């Protein structure tokens, strides 16, 4: 692919997301989604091979079905109230269809199956984009229509997402599928607090995005897509594996690391309403994500796996391309808890 | 739920309303600013470590820029956070003042007139 | 200024269709900004009375509004008859 | 739907045990039907008759568990003359767990299901007594 | 009640939808979609939407021509399936027909809420306008307002079409 | 009403012509007469086998260019607005975008058929 | 929700203008020149009251003015008007352009007999002013009293008491 | 709602069910997607015409445009799939699991 | 979530098409212009929570104009009673209803 064409496609993806974020008209929001998908399909196919083509096809089918349901919900809402402005969604059937369409776009359970497959079928850069930038538009719409949400449906989907993310991640040796299941669980956490406080949703999204960016950038720096290939990195660059171990611990939600901050905050918010059983269940379930993060840390940093002879040659060369934002991303992923009250600036 | 998005008079993308100028600014020795500078210094050290350069001595200009940028952003972040908390307190006090029926000050009782059950430990 | 003349000659000798298309498109783009009759077209469009003209209530302080269709006040279409 | 839930919950605890057992059986049957639908969708049974067999097996298991739970809980509440007591729900849950164990023909499944279902049913009864909310409506 | 023309056209619309949704073979699916496009054009015409009906008919005719070519190229087999050549396709078709007939009977003999709300019938003539004015077509004016009011829509639409050309070329480049 | 009657009349006339064609003459159909025609020799394969399309990219581009026709059709009515400058700017913008898309597909060998 | 007030049938009776569309079109310009005042009064009533039940007398006056206009036209130029409207009526689109001789004869007759001048192009489409004693309605939409807004934000902004007050943080 | 509205909604539901239930050909599912788009066009046009929402009359045309884009996208992907397998069966898209 | 770029810059990217009571070409009015105008003026500035209760009457009138459910219910009741009366034979329906009416322009 031409670099000019790649830049144009990335800019079109971002423009579709921005159009979703700045629009007041439902038609313009739908157009933003369409433009984002149209530009996103070729980016997933940048390195051409059958797996990338399969991932792109599955992604297109899922997102096109979601957009059809989105448009039908908009039209039903218009039928029962001649309104185009994104507001309290005057019809409940239309609101149910809207919620299901947005959940399918986000990959929330039980519309979760496509996320591990698409993530595994594409490159690490495409996976970074898909798991970070592609969450902004549906979450922005959900934040805008939160007051009309049905808490039962969204809470059911969020709890299912957390459970399924943990259970599915428990079974993986491929790093991209691990990241996808982690994303599913974190989306569940984000949507669990949405009917109560959208500021907490934004805070969780920001912290998750920072940690995911650090994770994907560390995985690109050490060209590993499997557990066994990541188990070699200690014999080439131990600093990368140590930073990865601390980042995994933060993603597990352990204090005093930054990944503990959202869950903590969310739990507190849920106890400001009554909502006692659900946060307890959510934390006990997030223990599963912590377990498979810890297994990855065992494989890559806390023990030393056997290496190969040809690795000696790799000792003689340095990394050519350097990521300028990786150190700041790591620091923000780990040492940010003491600045928790700054979340007031989010609302 | 969104508490403060529809608060009347809010300018969409301001980040710092003019009213916030009536609040005392954070001191330059604020411990939160010191921690932000510490975060910048840690970022510089990690940058040195990843690039296989001497961690403490490699780039002093780069480390200085890291610390300066973190402090510069942290100052305005702290200003906005303090403004938001001041706004919350202002609205809470005004609402309590305008709805006295929902916030009554009931008569005070001393502990010599309050009957509390005693539970012996044995 | 000399190489572009050769380029134009070569284009006219090899792809006259594209030369004519580009010339016509450029003329269509740039000419309307230089014509004095575009505003005449705007005025003609504005002078077409699709809807009924609802009369205004006389408060006694509108000397620019006619009291009858044939009164000298109000807009004139005499420019349109000479076009 | 919530119609079945209301049909079960409208009857008082230690009264009309047959009707409560019927309502619990209906709830269990609906749950088993949904489970079988998802199972057939995600794991095709290679034959239509095999799919019918799996649906019937799952639905009968669920309906039997529900019927046993409802009958045992109501009978315990009526015999002890102690409604609003989580012990009746615990006994019903263990009876349902033993029914599941017999249905799958496994002693470990029976014991684990007795313990866990009894505990869960007692917790549900405590929630009804104290007003615990699973899906809390937004308040603040 | 008046000639049932709109109801008949909408029923044929649903029938064509069932025809292509049972998925016999993309040739016959395209035929069913063409039939649906024609009856939808008729339905929209009966409400005063001449331009929109004609436009949607033309667009779907072009789309189905391209789909026919692609079916000949990439979606064929030795024995293409029709609605009576396979038990799955026939079952889906008959189920769709029976569902449509049951819904029609339910909403016509009774007045009950299928999913959203209730409906009694009376023909679609009741909710018309009796509006008496105009030397122009209102739909034409609204559609023509795209070039004076809908500048933003024109911008985003043109950008999307250019991006679509670039996108299809990138996708089919291969390598 | 009149258009429906016209359509019914035309379809009925065509159907009656087909009916007359199939029921008036004498029919003698046998297996060799109704066999597929391939210039006197039996075909090797089936006509239902995949037939390669060498101009598939042009077909997709035709799908995309067909919608610009729907976009540009209301121009006779759009030419009657009071703000003619905005309308002319937007119509020329759309036509320039279409020409740019054609030029892009042309220069990248997109109009050449596959070999 | 209350009953709807409707005029009686007897109140709706008026002498009718029973000439076809071609006849009306042939005399449209002179009709708009002569009967302008009652028509403008009726249109102002119609657009201000937003209720057809409140402008019935104005409609009756409009009918009376049209009847007087057509009575005069019959009294002075029966034949030229008949020829002109027959010419207009033959056309399928009822076009003015195809019959100018008959229009010229009718115009000459009305000018000489009644001193009537055909309006120039663009004069009948003017926005005019009308003097009426009808009071301007105050609530033509029958609107309810609007709900009162949330009061306001007032006072000077002071720092939050004891800071954020979030768990252990003292700032 | 009139009977016509229910008929159009039923058509949309039928097309959605047809899309969600794959048989073998990707082309048939793409046809179901196009049918859903057509049903949405008809429903929106009927609503906009009924309420005399003049400026909304341009909305259905916009829908069609993006429908075409979506239609083109799908076809492009199908080409690649066919070039990999010689067929457009959804059974062949099974290299990636959960 | 929502960055109100239009409000900050005063651009009006899409607000012209959000409601039916907003500046149509040639001043063509929507079928329910007055009802929507009244509901909007009622609900302006008080927030969604208060508007959902205090502007329920205007919204109900607007929805009745949009979908006309009660009007069809009333018409169906009248028609059913008339049909029963004629079937019993006591209706004695008028000439104007039967098409024998003396039309007026
Ligand atoms: C809570 C209170 C405050 C605490 C704050 C939080 C903690 C401290 C801040 C954290 C960040 C700071 C450092 C970041 C960069 C470090 C990266 C690194 O590689 O270090 C190597 C570097 C040595 O490299 P070198 O000198 O170039 O030559 C040696 C070779 O490079 C040889 O290098 P090599 O690569 O060949 O060696 C391989 C080695 C290389 O691997 C490593 O070195 C690991 C480093 C990972 C960085 C930490 C991750 C990100 C930060 C998150 C920390 C979370 C803390 C919360 C608690 C949870 C714990 C995880 O890997 C291994 O051997 C595998 C060991 C497996 C164990 C896995 C455990 C790792 C996680 C532990 C993290 C604990 C915190 C940091 C510990 C100190 C690190 C220096 O260490 C340093 O010398 C820098 C540290 C000291 C500088 C600061 C001193 C300031 C100036 C002095 C005056 C003080 C002023 C006071 C004012 C008053 C005036 C008088
Ligand atoms: C108390 C009131 C009601 C409570 C409701 C909540 C509790 C639900 C309990 C049901 C649990 C089902 C899952 C665990 C069973 C294991 C799977 C299995 O099929 O083995 C069967 C196993 C023996 O079969 P097997 O062939 O030997 O199994 C060996 C294979 O390894 C097994 O085959 P496999 O390993 O090859 O796997 C087959 C496949 C099978 O896949 C499944 O089974 C799916 C699981 C979904 C079950 C949830 C349905 C409950 C919904 C209730 C709604 C209200 C109902 C009224 O598994 C998967 O593929 C897993 C993939 C996960 C994808 C997630 C997709 C599911 C959608 C999300 C859940 C439902 C969404 C609903 C709405 C969502 C909208 C936000 O044992 C059974 O026969 C039990 C079947 C059903 C018993 C349920 C007990 C209900 C008792 C209620 C009594 C009433 C109390 C009185 C009330 C007052
Ligand atoms: C507004 C939003 C809402 C919109 C949505 C609503 C829209 C409604 C529109 C509906 C109009 C229809 C339009 C046409 C749709 C297109 C369908 C299609 O193309 O078929 C493709 C699809 C694949 O085509 P194919 O690859 O060429 O053929 C593969 C072979 O057929 C099979 O190959 P095999 O032999 O190797 O596989 C073994 C066999 C195995 O077959 C089986 O295992 C099925 C036997 C299950 C027994 C059913 C339980 C009996 C008792 C329950 C009764 C409940 C009420 C009473 C309560 C209890 C009473 C005591 O087949 C399968 O495993 C495939 C699974 C298909 C099962 C049906 C899927 C539906 C959901 C799952 C339900 C599972 C049933 C569990 C219980 C749940 C409630 C019923 O064909 C089929 O799967 C079967 C044909 C279905 C057509 C008729 C039914 C249409 C359903 C529409 C919704 C209702
Ligand atoms: C921190 C401190 C420590 C804390 C934790 C440490 C202590 C707790 C954990 C350790 C003990 C827990 C183990 C639980 C049961 C484990 C079974 C198992 O793992 O299954 C897999 C394992 C795998 O087997 P499989 O693969 O499915 O098939 C092959 C079979 O093995 C082949 O089977 P088979 O053909 O050889 O024969 C099996 C057959 C027959 O088995 C035989 O052939 C030999 C006969 C043995 C049965 C003994 C029953 C009659 C004697 C009991 C006398 C009274 C009990 C003592 C209390 C006196 C009170 C003053 O058994 C049955 O048919 C079951 C029918 C039920 C009758 C027994 C159940 C009575 C429950 C106790 C009620 C107590 C209520 C509270 C009382 C309060 C006052 C103190 O199953 C077995 O092999 C064992 C089967 C028999 C086990 C049942 C014995 C119950 C033991 C007492 C339970 C109390 C703890 C739980 C209470 C809380 C629950 C709410
Ligand atoms: C050169 C350094 C310099 O210029 O010093 C000036 C500056 C003079 O400020 P100061 O007003 O005289 O300090 C008064 C007392 O230090 C005490 O000042 P304060 O009472 O205003 O405390 C400030 C306040 C707000 O400040 C903070 O929240 C940031 C403090 C960093 C937390 C420590 C974590 C790693 C070190 O700290 C807290 O609210 C306590 C929360 C800390 C827990 C953070 C959550 C993570 C869990 C633990 C891991 O000295 C410092 O900033 C202290 C060194 C840091
Ligand atoms: C894991 C660490 C998280 C860090 C996340 C990235 C940090 C660096 C990014 C820098 C942000 C640049 C923004 C500054 C330019 C001004 C933009 C300004 O106009 O935006 C305002 C918005 O301000 C921003 O939201 C503030 C950004 C600051 C975020 C930091 C809070 C993180 C939580 C505490 C963790 C400690 C952070 C430590 C920092 C290094 C407008 O508000 P508004 O248009 O009405 O909001 C729209 C959305 N609403 C209405 C639905 C709410
Ligand atoms: C008095 C001076 C007149 C000035 C007129 C204006 C400038 C005229 C010259 C501008 C460019 C003229 C044509 C381009 C140069 C010559 C053609 C060329 O580049 O190579 C030909 C080659 C075609 O030949 P092949 O198909 O490759 O042959 C294969 C078999 N051998 O051209 C190309 O590769 C690309 C052609 C792109 C065509 C552009 C698409 C259509 C655009 C025109 C529509 C209207 C445009 C109006 C808007 C623009 C306003 C300024």
Other beta carbons less than 10 A from residue H6's beta carbon: 22
- Can you give the residue range of the structural domain that contains E11? 5-173
Burial of G106 (0-12, 13-18, 19+ CB in 10 A): buried
The answer to whether the CB atoms of B19 and G160 lie below 8 A apart is no
CA distance F64 to E167: 11
Q: Could you say which of H29, H74, H96 has the minimum Cβ distance to residue A120?
A: H96
Distance A345 CA to ligand 6 centre (A): 6
Distance B80 CA to ligand 6 centre (A): 10
Residues in chain B within 8 Å Cβ distance of G170: none
How far is E28 from chain I, CA to nearest CA, in Å?
Answer: 38
Identify the H or E element spanning G130.
Answer: strand G129-130
Measured CA to CA in angstroms, residue C35 lies from A153, E80, F86, G100 at distances of 63, 62, 16, 35
The answer to whether the CB atoms of I3 and B6 lie below 8 A apart is no
Q: Which residues pair with H89 in a beta bridge?
A: H25
CA distance I73 to E120: 9
Phi, psi of A113 (to 5 degrees): -65, -30
Residues in chain C within 8 Å Cβ distance of I27: 51
CA distance F93 to G82: 54
Domains within chain H, CATH numbers bracketed: 3-92 (1.10.287.3510)
Asked whether A347 and A199 are in contact (CB, 8 A), the reply is yes
How far is residue E162 CA from its own chain's centroid? 26
Looking up tokens 């719409």 gives A141
CA distance F102 to F111: 9
Q: Does the beta carbon of A79 sit less than 6 angstroms from any atom of ligand 6?
A: no
- Can you give the residue range of the structural domain that contains F103? 1-108
Q: With respect to residue F79, please indicate whether it lies within any of the assigned structural domains.
A: yes
Q: With respect to residue F5, please indicate whether it lies within any of the assigned structural domains.
A: yes
CA distance H57 to E52: 9
Identify the H or E element spanning E37.
Answer: helix E26-45
The answer to whether the CB atoms of A197 and B5 lie below 8 A apart is no
Closest CA relative to residue G132, chosen from G62, G46, G44: G44
Distance D114 CA to ligand 4 centre (A): 12
- Cα first-last separation, chain B: 50
Tell me the two tokens of residue G4: 């709807």
Measured CA to CA in angstroms, residue E2 lies from A184, D44, E6, G158 at distances of 55, 49, 9, 72
Asked whether H4 and E7 are in contact (CB, 8 A), the reply is yes
Tell me the two tokens of residue A282: 């959510």
Residues in chain G within 8 Å Cβ distance of C77: 120-122
Q: Which residues pair with A226 in a beta bridge?
A: A174
- A106-117: burial string, b at 16+ Cβ within 10 Å, e else: bbbbebbbbbbb
Looking at the complex, does the CB of residue I26 fall below 8 Å from at least one CB of chain C?
yes
Asked whether A139 and A201 are in contact (CB, 8 A), the reply is yes
Any contact of I with D, at least 3 CB pairs below 8 A? Answer: no
Tell me the two tokens of residue B62: 């780069």
Closest CA relative to residue F74, chosen from F95, F96, F91: F91
Q: Which residues pair with B114 in a beta bridge?
A: none
What is the tally of helices (H) and strands (E) in chain E? 6, 0
The answer to whether the CB atoms of B12 and I7 lie below 8 A apart is yes
Handedness of CA I29, I32, I38, I42 (dihedral sign): negative
Closest CA relative to residue G58, chosen from G36, G43, G68: G43
Question: CA angle, G73 as apex, G68 and G76 as ends, to 5°?
Answer: 125
- Cα first-last separation, chain E: 61
Q: Could you say which of E51, E80, E148 has the minimum Cβ distance to residue F83?
A: E148
Looking up tokens 């994500």 gives A289
Q: Could you say which of F63, F64, F70 has the minimum Cβ distance to residue H61?
A: F70
Identify the H or E element spanning G1.
Answer: none
Tell me the two tokens of residue A34: 């369409």
Closest CA relative to residue D139, chosen from E117, I8, A151: A151
Looking up tokens 């809010």 gives B10
Q: Could you say which of B5, B6, B13 has the minimum Cβ distance to residue I8?
A: B13
Tell me the two tokens of residue G149: 């807004």
The CATH number covering residue E145 comes to 1.20.120.1200
Tell me the two tokens of residue C77: 């279409």
Measured CA to CA in angstroms, residue D22 lies from B55, D80, D84, E45 at distances of 74, 21, 21, 55
The residue to mutate among F103, F104, F110, having the most atoms of ligand 7 within 8 angstroms of its beta carbon, is: F103
Tell me the two tokens of residue I89: 């034979």
Asked whether H80 and E165 are in contact (CB, 8 A), the reply is no
Closest residue in F to E57 (Cα–Cα):
F70
CA distance G155 to F47: 86
Handedness of CA G103, G107, G109, G110 (dihedral sign): positive
Measured CA to CA in angstroms, residue E6 lies from E45, G40, H47, H48 at distances of 10, 42, 15, 17
Identify the H or E element spanning D71.
Answer: helix D48-80
Q: Which residues pair with A174 in a beta bridge?
A: A226
The residue to mutate among D44, D47, D58, D62, having the most atoms of ligand 3 within 8 angstroms of its beta carbon, is: D44
Handedness of CA H44, H45, H46, H51 (dihedral sign): positive
Question: CA angle, A221 as apex, A215 and A224 as ends, to 5°?
Answer: 80
Residues in chain I within 8 Å Cβ distance of G149: 45-46
Q: With respect to residue F113, please indicate whether it lies within any of the assigned structural domains.
A: no
Q: What is the CA radius of gyration of chain B?
A: 25
Each as own residue / partner, the long-range contacts of residues E106-113 (CB below 8 Å, 24 or more positions apart, any chain) are E107/H3, E107/H6, E108/H3
**Chains in contact with A via at least 3 Cβ–Cβ pairs below 8 Å:** B, D, E, G, H, I
Looking up tokens 């996708």 gives E171
The answer to whether the CB atoms of B89 and G158 lie below 8 A apart is yes
Asked whether E157 and F71 are in contact (CB, 8 A), the reply is yes
Looking up tokens 């299912």 gives A160
The answer to whether the CB atoms of A65 and H95 lie below 8 A apart is no
Best residue of C32, C40, C48 to probe chain F, by most F CBs closer than 10 Å = C32
Whether the ω angle into residue A110 lies within 30 degrees of 0, i.e. cis, is yes
Given resolution (angstroms): 2.5
Contacts of G141 (CB under 8 A, 6+ apart): G50, I34, I37, I38
Other beta carbons less than 10 A from residue E68's beta carbon: 16
What technique was this entry resolved by?
Answer: cryo-EM
Distance H16 CA to ligand 3 centre (A): 14
Tell me the two tokens of residue D138: 């937004």
Measured CA to CA in angstroms, residue G148 lies from B6, B93, G141, I42, I46 at distances of 17, 22, 19, 10, 8
Asked whether D125 and D86 are in contact (CB, 8 A), the reply is yes
Residues in chain H within 8 Å Cβ distance of E18: 14
Other beta carbons less than 10 A from residue E23's beta carbon: 28
CA distance E58 to H64: 11
Asked whether A32 and A16 are in contact (CB, 8 A), the reply is yes
CA distance A127 to E100: 44
Tell me the two tokens of residue B48: 């040195």
Strand, coil or helix: H30: helix
Closest CA relative to residue F82, chosen from C39, B74, B70: C39
The answer to whether the CB atoms of B90 and G155 lie below 8 A apart is yes
Q: Check residue G155 and give left, alpha or beta (phi > 0: left; psi -120 to 50: alpha).
A: left
Identify the H or E element spanning C56.
Answer: strand C56-57
CA distance A132 to A118: 14
Q: With respect to residue F70, please indicate whether it lies within any of the assigned structural domains.
A: yes
Asked whether A213 and A132 are in contact (CB, 8 A), the reply is yes
Asked whether A218 and A326 are in contact (CB, 8 A), the reply is yes
Q: Which residues pair with A85 in a beta bridge?
A: A25
CA distance A171 to A168: 6
Looking up tokens 């609204």 gives E142
Give how many domains chain E has, as a whole number.
Answer: 1
Looking up tokens 């040195």 gives B48
- D54-64: burial string, b at 16+ Cβ within 10 Å, e else: bbeebbebbbb
Q: Which residues pair with G130 in a beta bridge?
A: C57
DSSP string, E41-72: HHHHHTTT-HHHHHHHHHHHHHHHHHHHHHHH
The CATH number covering residue F63 comes to 1.20.58.1610
Q: Does the beta carbon of A297 sit less than 6 angstroms from any atom of ligand 1?
A: no
Closest residue in I to H57 (Cα–Cα):
I17
- Going by the DSSP 8-state scheme, the letter that residue I10 receives in this structure is T
Phi, psi of C56 (to 5 degrees): -95, 145
Tell me the two tokens of residue C42: 């705007």
Asked whether B115 and B67 are in contact (CB, 8 A), the reply is no
Distance D121 CA to ligand 4 centre (A): 22
Best residue of G128, G136, G137, G138 to probe chain C, by most C CBs closer than 10 Å = G128
Q: Does the beta carbon of D79 sit less than 6 angstroms from any atom of ligand 3?
A: no
**Helix, strand, coil percentages for chain A (3-state, nearest 5):** 75, 0, 25
Strand, coil or helix: A25: strand
Give how many domains chain F has, as a whole number.
Answer: 1
Closest CA relative to residue H61, chosen from E161, A77, A64: E161
Other beta carbons less than 10 A from residue A136's beta carbon: 18
Burial of F93 (0-12, 13-18, 19+ CB in 10 A): middle
What is the tally of helices (H) and strands (E) in chain I? 5, 0
Distance B31 CA to ligand 5 centre (A): 4
Other beta carbons less than 10 A from residue A58's beta carbon: 21
Asked whether E21 and H14 are in contact (CB, 8 A), the reply is yes
- Going by the DSSP 8-state scheme, the letter that residue G47 receives in this structure is H
Tell me the two tokens of residue E135: 């030397």
Closest CA relative to residue A77, chosen from E93, H44, I48, C75: H44
The answer to whether the CB atoms of A275 and D140 lie below 8 A apart is no
Looking at the complex, does the CB of residue E11 fall below 8 Å from at least one CB of chain H?
yes
Q: Which is the closest atom of ligand 5 to the Cα of B29?
A: 6
CA distance I25 to I15: 15
Strand, coil or helix: G57: helix
Looking at the complex, does the CB of residue I72 fall below 8 Å from at least one CB of chain E?
yes
Other beta carbons less than 10 A from residue A192's beta carbon: 28
CA distance A24 to A29: 8
Q: Which is the closest atom of ligand 6 to the Cα of A336?
A: 36
Looking at the complex, does the CB of residue I71 fall below 8 Å from at least one CB of chain H?
no
| Least distant ligand from the CA of A261 | 6
Strand, coil or helix: H55: helix
Residues in chain A within 8 Å Cβ distance of B44: 327
Q: Where are the alpha helices (DSSP H) in F1-115?
A: 2-23, 56-72, 75-78, 84-107
CA distance E6 to E42: 8
């Amino acid at each position: 692919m031409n670099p000019i064409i790649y830049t144009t496609l990335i800019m079109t993806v971002m423009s579709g997301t921005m159009l979703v974020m700045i629009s007041s008209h439902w038609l313009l929001i739908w157009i933003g989604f369409e433009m984002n998908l149209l530009a996103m399909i070729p980016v997933l196919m940048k390195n051409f091979n059958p797996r990338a083509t399969e991932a792109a096809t599955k992604y297109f089918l899922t997102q096109a079905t979601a957009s059809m349901m989105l448009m039908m919900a908009i039209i039903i809402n218009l039928l029962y109230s001649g309104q185009w402005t994104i507001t309290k969604m005057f019809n409940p059937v239309a609101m149910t269809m809207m919620t299901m369409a947005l959940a399918m776009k986000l990959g929330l359970s039980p519309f979760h199956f496509w996320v591990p497959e698409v993530t595994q079928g594409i490159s690490l850069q495409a996976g970074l984009l898909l798991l970070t930038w592609q969450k902004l538009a549906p979450l922005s719409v959900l934040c805008q229509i939160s007051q009309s949400i049905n808490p039962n449906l969204m809470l059911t989907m969020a709890m299912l997402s957390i459970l399924i993310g943990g259970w599915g991640g428990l079974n993986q040796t491929q790093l991209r599928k691990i990241m996808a299941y982690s994303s599913i669980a974190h989306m569940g956490w984000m949507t669990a607090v949405l009917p109560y406080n959208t500021t907490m949703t934004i805070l969780n999204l920001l912290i998750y995005i920072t940690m995911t960016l650090a994770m994907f950038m560390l995985l690109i720096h050490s060209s590993a897509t499997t557990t066994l290939s990541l188990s070699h990195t200690w014999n080439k660059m131990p600093v990368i594996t140590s930073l990865m171990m601390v980042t995994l611990l933060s993603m597990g939600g352990l204090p005093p690391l930054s990944g503990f901050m959202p869950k903590w905050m969310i739990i507190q918010e849920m106890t400001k309403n009554e909502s006692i059983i659900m946060p307890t269940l959510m934390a006990m379930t997030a223990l599963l994500n912590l377990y498979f993060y810890m297994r990855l840390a065992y494989s890559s940093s806390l023990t030393m796996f056997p290496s190969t002879n040809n690795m000696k040659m790799k000792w003689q060369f340095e990394h050519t391309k350097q990521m300028k934002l990786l150190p700041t991303m790591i620091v923000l992923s780990t040492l940010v808890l003491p600045m928790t009250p700054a979340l007031s600036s989010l609302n | 739920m969104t508490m403060m998005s529809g608060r009347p008079g809010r300018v969409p993308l301001q980040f710092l309303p003019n009213e916030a100028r009536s609040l005392p600014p954070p001191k330059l020795t604020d411990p939160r600013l010191v921690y932000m500078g510490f975060l910048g210094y840690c970022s510089g050290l990690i940058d040195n470590a990843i690039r296989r350069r001497p961690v403490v001595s490699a780039g002093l200009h780069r480390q200085l820029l890291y610390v300066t940028s973190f402090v510069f952003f942290g100052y305005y972040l702290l200003k906005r956070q303090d403004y938001m908390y001041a706004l919350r307190d202002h609205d809470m006090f005004a609402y309590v003042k305008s709805h006295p029926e929902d916030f009554p000050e009931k008569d005070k009782k001393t502990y010599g007139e309050i009957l509390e059950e005693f539970h012996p430990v044995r | 200024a000399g190489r572009i003349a050769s380029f134009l000659k070569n284009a006219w000798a090899k792809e006259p269709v594209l030369v004519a298309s580009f010339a016509i498109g450029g003329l269509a783009i740039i000419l309307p900004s230089l014509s004095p009759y575009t505003n005449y077209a705007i005025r003609i469009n504005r002078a077409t009375p699709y809807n009924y003209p609802v009369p205004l209530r006389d408060d006694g302080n509108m000397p620019d509004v006619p009291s009858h269709p044939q009164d000298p006040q109000g807009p004139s279409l005499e420019w349109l008859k000479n076009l | 739907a919530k119609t079945l839930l209301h049909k079960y919950s409208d009857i008082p605890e230690g009264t009309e045990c047959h009707r409560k057992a019927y309502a619990s059986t209906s709830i269990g049957g609906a749950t088993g039907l949904i489970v079988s639908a998802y199972s057939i969708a995600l794991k095709p049974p290679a034959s239509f008759l095999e799919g019918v067999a799996r649906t019937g097996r799952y639905t009968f298991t669920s309906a039997a568990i529900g019927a046993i739970f409802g009958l045992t809980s109501c009978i315990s509440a009526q015999v002890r003359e102690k409604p609003d007591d989580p012990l009746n729900y615990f006994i019903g849950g263990c009876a349902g767990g033993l029914t599941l164990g017999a249905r799958t023909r496994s002693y470990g499944i029976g014991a684990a299901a007795c313990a866990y279902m009894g505990l869960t049913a007692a917790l549900v009864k405590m929630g009804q007594l104290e007003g615990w909310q699973v899906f809390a409506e937004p308040k603040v | 009640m008046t000639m049932y023309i709109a109801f008949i056209l909408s029923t044929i619309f649903v029938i064509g939808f069932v025809g292509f949704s049972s998925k016999p073979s993309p040739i016959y699916g395209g035929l069913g979609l063409i039939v649906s496009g024609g009856v939808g054009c008729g339905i929209v015409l009966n409400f005063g939407g001449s331009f929109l009906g004609l436009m949607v008919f033309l667009i779907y005719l072009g789309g189905m021509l391209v789909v026919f070519g692609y079916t000949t190229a990439m979606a064929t087999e030795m024995y293409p399936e029709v609605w009576v050549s396979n038990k799955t396709v026939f079952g889906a078709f008959v189920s769709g027909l029976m569902m449509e007939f049951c819904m029609v009977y339910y909403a016509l003999k009774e007045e009950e809420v299928e999913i959203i709300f209730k409906f009694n019938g009376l023909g679609d003539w009741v909710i018309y306008d009796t509006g008496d004015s105009g030397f122009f077509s209102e739909e034409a004016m609204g559609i023509a307002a795209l070039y004076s009011y809908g500048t933003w829509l024109v911008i985003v639409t043109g950008w999307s079409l250019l991006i679509g050309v670039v996108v299809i070329m990138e996708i089919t480049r291969g390598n | 009403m009149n258009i429906m009657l016209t359509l019914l009349t035309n379809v009925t006339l065509a159907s009656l012509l087909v009916l007359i064609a199939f029921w008036l003459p004498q029919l003698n159909a046998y297996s060799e007469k109704t066999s597929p025609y391939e210039c006197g020799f039996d075909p090797m394969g089936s006509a239902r086998l995949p037939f390669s399309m060498k101009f598939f990219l042009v077909a997709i581009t035709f799908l995309l260019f067909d919608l610009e026709i729907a976009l540009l059709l209301p121009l006779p009515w759009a030419s009657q607005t009071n703000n003619l400058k905005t309308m002319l700017t937007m119509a020329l913008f759309l036509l320039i975008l279409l020409a740019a898309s054609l030029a892009y597909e042309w220069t990248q060998k997109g109009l050449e058929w596959a070999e | 929700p209350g009953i709807v007030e409707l005029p009686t049938l007897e109140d709706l009776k008026v002498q009718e203008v029973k000439v076809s569309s071609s006849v009306l079109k042939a005399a449209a310009h002179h009709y708009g020149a002569q009967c302008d005042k009652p028509n403008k009064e009726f249109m102002l009533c119609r657009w201000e009251e937003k209720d057809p039940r409140r402008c019935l007398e104005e409609g009756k006056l409009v009918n009376q003015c049209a009847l007087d206009f057509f009575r005069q036209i019959k009294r002075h130029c029966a034949e030229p008007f008949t020829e002109y409207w027959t010419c207009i009526d033959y056309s399928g689109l009822q076009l003015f352009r195809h019959c100018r001789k008959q229009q010229a004869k009718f115009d000459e007759c009305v000018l000489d007999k009644l001193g009537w001048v055909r309006p120039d192009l663009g004069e009948l489409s003017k926005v005019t002013k009308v003097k009426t004693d009808r009071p301007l309605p105050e609530n033509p939409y029958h609107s309810r009293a609007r709900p009162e807004p949330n009061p306001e934000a007032e006072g000077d902004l002071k720092p939050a008491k004891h800071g954020s007050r979030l768990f252990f943080w003292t700032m | 709602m009139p009977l016509v509205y229910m008929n159009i909604i039923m058509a949309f539901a039928i097309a959605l069910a047809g899309l969600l239930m794959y048989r073998s050909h990707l082309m048939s599912s793409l046809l179901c997607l196009e049918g859903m788009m057509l049903s949405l066009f008809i429903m929106s046009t009927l609503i906009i015409l009924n309420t005399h929402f003049t400026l909304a009359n341009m909305m259905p045309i916009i829908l069609l445009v993006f429908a075409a884009c979506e239609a083109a996208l799908g076809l492009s992907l199908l080409v690649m799939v066919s070039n990999t397998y010689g067929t457009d069966y959804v059974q062949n898209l099974n290299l990636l699991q959960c | 979530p929502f960055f109100d770029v239009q409000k900050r810059l005063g651009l009006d990217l899409d607000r012209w098409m959000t409601i039916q009571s907003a500046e149509q070409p040639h001043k063509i009015p929507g079928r329910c212009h007055a009802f929507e105008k009244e509901w909007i003026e009622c609900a302006h500035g008080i927030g969604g929570i208060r508007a959902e209760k205090e502007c329920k009457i205007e919204f109900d009138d607007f929805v009745e104009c949009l979908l006309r459910q009660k009007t069809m219910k009333r018409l169906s009741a009248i028609k059913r009673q008339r049909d029963k009366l004629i079937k019993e034979g006591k209706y004695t329906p008028p000439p104007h209803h039967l098409g024998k009416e003396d039309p007026r322009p």
